[PDB]
Structure formats: structure tokens, C-alpha cells
């Protein structure tokens, strides 16, 4: 059983008020059953698109989630992951640079 690593980054330079895409890349987990949410101000974003799950050379699973977003300096964004390897959900906040 392996713990998911979470990386949160934007598709284009994060400019306040300009529509962009936020990515949540979840890697190195086993087993493949996983729950992934993206959050705006701590609330679940409804329309989040998901890549097909796949796996790496080392057999650990990976998946990409992404959602449309418009960064502003009044909004936080996060990726929250639920997985059997962890007692509680793991949340990674977009660090506003990535």
C-alpha cells in the first residue's frame, strides 16, 4: 500500500482575472481506488475533469485532474485526496506560483 503524492500547478501563467486551467497530478499510490476533489475556498468544484487512470514503470498508479479557474487575490485553490493508505483526506493548496 502506497501513499498518493499530490502536485498542483497551472497550465498558463497565473494572472489575476484571466481564465486558466488548474492541474492536480496525483501519483505513486496503490491500490488504485482513489477519491480526488478540487476545491475553491474549501468547497468542492463541480466540473472537474479526470484523465484515465494509468500506471508507471514501477506499477504505482497516477491520474491527472484539471479544472477551469480564474485566479484572483481573494480565492484559494486546493486538491483533496482520499485514499485507503491515509487515515484522513490529504489536502494540498495551490501555492499561487505553480
Amino acid at each position: 500500500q502506497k501513499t498518493p503524492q499530490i502536485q498542483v500547478y497551472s497550465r498558463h501563467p497565473p494572472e489575476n482575472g484571466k481564465p486558466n486551467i488548474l492541474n492536480c497530478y496525483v501519483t505513486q499510490f496503490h491500490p488504485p481506488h482513489i477519491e480526488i476533489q478540487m476545491l475553491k475556498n474549501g468547497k468542492k468544484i463541480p466540473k472537474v475533469e479526470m484523465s484515465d487512470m494509468s500506471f508507471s514503470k514501477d506499477w504505482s498508479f497516477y491520474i491527472l485532474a484539471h479544472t477551469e479557474f480564474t485566479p484572483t487575490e481573494t480565492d484559494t485553490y486546493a486538491c483533496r485526496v482520499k485514499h485507503a493508505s491515509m487515515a484522513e483526506p490529504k489536502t494540498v493548496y495551490w501555492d499561487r506560483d505553480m
Binding site: 498558463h12 497530478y25 496503490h30 488504485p32 484523465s51 500506471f55 506560483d97
Partner: protein, 267 residues
């Protein structure tokens, strides 16, 4: 070098629940998906059929359709037989395909993992457990090896079908496979970590460096390559600096898509 990988993921939760899903990759581009819920293999490119005729494709698909059902039954039957010693939940993964070499043909592979660990491969004319695999696998593999028709089919798929289908994909998918997408870069950060972000490049090879004039800064730590959702890549390169030393630094990006015109971003 192009590696074609068919990746199969089977989850057996209990006696009444299982699913098998597959994804297929040519290099870093997805060409197929095969959901449990679908009877047919889905194309994720206009060229996912390669050089194969509609009838030729249906036959190959039919063979995979039969396989998926047989495999699911075989595993459930195996678990019943092994009970309670081998029990649910169970994750089986298969990685099969071929790596295409310049001019000269190819090597093929079929690797199987159980509970996230590599245990079984097909090699030569037979299935085999790998050293360290649980010994309870030896008997069912010996049984599988007794099935000549399956062994012949597998040998055909690996040695012949795989490189032929892939040569068809390389021709049919040429414009996609050889696509060029330009990176866009941006900077962010008394001891600062300076971050150069590079996003939207394709293909994967790229060069990203922190510079002071013409001098490469060897403290540059390159991050992992991260996928964007639009079949392009994301990379960052960071440099650890002290405060008031940031002036005169730049991030330089070289990439095939830029035609010799590097991105230079001055801090």
C-alpha cells in the same frame, strides 16, 4: 525509440465484484482506452486503428474481448481454488507491448504484477514466474503453459502483431507524433528559492537553466516532468539564492518548437 504499452488494470474486490480497465500509450500519447463498461476498444486518436482495415480491427478486438472474459473467469476460479490462503481484495496489472528501434525491428514484453509487485512475464515460448514471486503461482503458471493455443497466440501478438500494428500507428499518426508545441515560461519565488515555470511544451525533451549572463548556474534543480491535460508538458527549475543577488539572473529555455529562438526571462 517509440514504446507501445498496453496497460491493463484489474481490481477484484470480492467474489461478486471485479473490473478490468485498459489504457494504451504510444510513447507519451494515449492512443486507446478500454473501459470495463464498454464492449469495444475506444479510440483516443483519429489514427488509433493504425493501418488496420475495419475487419482486421474487429478480429483483433474480438480476440481481446474473448481474453478479457477468460482472464476474469480464470482469476476468480484461481481465487476460489486457493481460498482461504489467497483472498480478496486483489489487484492485477499487465504491461504488454513493444519498443520500436531505429530501422531495425523491435523487442516485445509482457509483464504481470500482483498486489503492485512484478511476478510473471511471458518470454520466449512460455509464461514464467520471476525470481522472488510467491511460490503458489508456480502451479497455475505450469497449467497456463500447457495451453499451447494460448502460448501460440501470445507469441504471435508479441513477436508479429505488435510491431506491425505500431508501424501502422507511426505512419497514420505522424503529424500528431511529430507535433511541436511552444513552452510558455514565468518566474516566481533573506534566502529565496527562485522558480522558473515552463508549460505547454511538446515533445518532452527540453532544456531549462538559470543563468547569470552566459554562465549556467549549476545550483539549478530541475523538477519532475508533469503532464498538462492537453498532451503538453510542465516543468519547473529552481535555484536557491541569497537576498540581493537576484539581479542579473535569468531563466533560459531551449526547445525544438522555438526554432533556435530561446525564451530568456530576466528576474
Amino acid at each position: 525509440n517509440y514504446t507501445f504499452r498496453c496497460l491493463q488494470m484489474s481490481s477484484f474486490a470480492n467474489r461478486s465484484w471485479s473490473r478490468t480497465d485498459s489504457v494504451v500509450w504510444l510513447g507519451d500519447l494515449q492512443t486507446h482506452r478500454w473501459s470495463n463498461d464498454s464492449a469495444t476498444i475506444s479510440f483516443t486518436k483519429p489514427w488509433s486503428q493504425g493501418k488496420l482495415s475495419n475487419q482486421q480491427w474487429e478480429k483483433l478486438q474480438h480476440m481481446f474481448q474473448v481474453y478479457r472474459v477468460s482472464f476474469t473467469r480464470d482469476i476468480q476460479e484461481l481465487v476460489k481454488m486457493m481460498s482461504p490462503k489467497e483472498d480478496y481484495p486483489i489487484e492485477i496489472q499487465l504491461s504488454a507491448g513493444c519498443e520500436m528501434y531505429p530501422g531495425n525491428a523491435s523487442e516485445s514484453f509482457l509483464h504481470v504484477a500482483f498486489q503492485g509487485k512484478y511476478v510473471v512475464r511471458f518470454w520466449g515460448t512460455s509464461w514464467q514466474t520471476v525470481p522472488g514471486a510467491p511460490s503458489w503461482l508456480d502451479l497455475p503458471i505450469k497449467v497456463l503453459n500447457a495451453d499451447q493455443g494460448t502460448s501460440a497466440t501470445v507469441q504471435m501478438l508479441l513477436n508479429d502483431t505488435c510491431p506491425l500494428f505500431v508501424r501502422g500507428l507511426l505512419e497514420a499518426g505522424k503529424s500528431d507524433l511529430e507535433k511541436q508545441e511552444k513552452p510558455v515560461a514565468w518566474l516566481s519565488s533573506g534566502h529565496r528559492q527562485l522558480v522558473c515555470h515552463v508549460s505547454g511544451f511538446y515533445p518532452k525533451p527540453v532544456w531549462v537553466m538559470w543563468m547569470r549572463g552566459d554562465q549556467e548556474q549549476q545550483g539549478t534543480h530541475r523538477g519532475d516532468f508533469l503532464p498538462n491535460a492537453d498532451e503538453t508538458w510542465y516543468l519547473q527549475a529552481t535555484l536557491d539564492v541569497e537576498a540581493g543577488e537576484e539581479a542579473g539572473l535569468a531563466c533560459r529555455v531551449k526547445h525544438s518548437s522555438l526554432g533556435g529562438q530561446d525564451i530568456i526571462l530576466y528576474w
